[PDB]
Amino acid sequence: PGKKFVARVEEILHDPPVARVKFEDGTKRVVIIPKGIKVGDVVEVKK
Amino acid sequence: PGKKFVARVEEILHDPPVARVKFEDGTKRVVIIPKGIKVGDVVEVKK
């Protein structure tokens, strides 16, 4: 299935979308999110 | 969907953008990234 991780969306980089998200421990990852996500959202993400 | 891969951005080559990224295992790939990415970021990339 995957592991349990929560991150917060800071900046969305849409350019015809990806998101820079901060995890629980200050880590920053830029992940692929579907169109509909906004900044400030909390998302569940794995490895 | 795609597989799970993490890479680190080393150099951005913007010239009117692409990025040289190192994966988990020292591999280097130059991928297409949207405008907003910076060097040192960790990005999720597939095949």
Numbering used by the authors:
A (entry chain A), B (entry chain A): 4 to 19, 24 to 54
The article reads:
Here, we study fold transition between distinct β-barrels by protein engineering and structural biology technique. Here, we discover that the previously reconstructed ancient DPBB sequence could also adopt a β-barrel fold named Double-Zeta β-barrel (DZBB), as a metamorphic protein. The DZBB fold is not found in any modern protein, although its structure shares similarities with RIFT and OB. Furthermore, the reconstructed OB fold could also be converted to the four-stranded SH3 fold by a simple circular permutation. Thus, these ancient β-barrel folds (DPBB, RIFT, OB, and SH3) could be readily interconverted by a few feasible mutations through the missing-link fold, DZBB, indicating their significantly close evolutionary relationships.
To examine what determines the DZBB–OB transition, additional intermediates have been engineered by sequential mutagenesis and experimental validation steps (design-12–17). The 2nd generation mutants, design-13 (tkoL2_v1.2) and design-16 (mkaL2_v1.2), have ~60% sequence identities with design-2 (DZBB-fold), and retained moderate thermostability. In these designs, only a short segment was from rL2 (segment 1: from the middle of β1 to the start of β3), and the other parts are from design-2. Helix α1 (segment 2) was also omitted. The crystallographic analysis revealed that design-13 still adopts the four-stranded OB fold, indicating that segment 1, but not segment 2, could serve as the determinant for the fold transition between the DZBB and OB structures. Only high concentrations of design-13 and -16 retarded the migration of dsDNA slightly. The acquisition of the weak DNA binding affinity of these two proteins may have resulted from additional lysine residues at the end of β3 and the 3rd loop, compared to other OB-fold chimeras.
